[PDB]
């Protein structure tokens, strides 16, 4: 477009982010589709044990203050989930970090109860990886899916 009454409309009215829900029945139309959905049930799986150097690298590979993604103007890290033998991080704690660092600090953390499409018995003896439970901006239980 060719003037400034239109460039504001393409940034405020008919942009993509305001078109998140359909105006048909309010269902979403954005979203990751094939690669990452089946990829995400591996990082959120319980066997994801990142080491120290990977943990910033998976964080810095998706979060760049240089290009300006963050809000805190410095990438902040979490304590690992294993301390004494060998310090390892966790993939649910990566989703804890990428909710910490692209959400504003004035608001507090998130809280969410949600289900999956994985039934509980696929992980062993009735474990609770169907109930995706966010508390205080953390992925404390549950694997991330299309749902």
């Amino acid at each position: 477009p060719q003037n400034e009454n239109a460039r504001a409309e393409a940034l405020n009215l008919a942009n993509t982010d305001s078109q998140y829900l359909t105006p048909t029945s309010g269902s979403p139309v954005r979203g990751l589709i094939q690669d990452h959905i089946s990829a995400g049930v591996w990082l959120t799986s319980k066997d994801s044990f990142f080491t120290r150097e990977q943990y910033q690298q998976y964080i810095y590979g998706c979060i760049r203050p240089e290009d300006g993604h963050t809000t805190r103007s410095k990438i902040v890290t979490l304590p690992p989930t294993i301390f004494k033998p060998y310090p390892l991080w966790t993939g649910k704690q990566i989703i804890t970090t990428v909710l910490l660092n692209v959400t504003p600090p004035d608001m507090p953390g998130i809280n969410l109860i949600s289900k999956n499409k994985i039934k509980n018995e696929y992980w062993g003896k009735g474990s609770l990886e169907n109930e995706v439970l966010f508390k205080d901006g953390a992925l404390l239980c549950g694997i991330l899916d299309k749902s």
Binding site: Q56, P65, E66, I75, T77
Partner: protein
């Protein structure tokens, strides 16, 4: 007399004032020395944060980001790593010249 002031390009809008959180954008790079340096920076115990990134693989871009704990700016921890990326090649050559010549 010519400085090539376009290689080690330090972005400033993601840079701490004290220099303990610096921001680069290295051209004529990709995953080649991106991960070869990121290994060697993270061996320095003063370094608190070091990842290397690529915004888009098409052109030559390598945004890396050193952050430290204290008493050393991130550029002063860069140049220890590039000192210890060279001294590795001192070790590899004189342990691979010493084996070609040893048969």
């Amino acid at each position: 007399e010519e400085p090539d002031r376009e290689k080690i390009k330090l972005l400033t809008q993601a840079t701490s004032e004290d220099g303990t959180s610096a921001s680069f954008q290295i051209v004529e790079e990709d995953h080649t020395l991106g991960n070869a340096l990121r290994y060697v920076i993270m061996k320095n115990p003063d370094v608190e944060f070091c990842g290397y990134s690529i915004p888009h693989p098409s052109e030559n871009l390598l945004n890396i980001r050193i952050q430290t704990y204290g008493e050393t700016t991130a550029v002063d921890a860069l140049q220890k790593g590039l000192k210890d990326l060279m001294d590795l090649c001192d070790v590899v050559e004189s342990k691979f010249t010493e084996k070609i010549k040893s048969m």
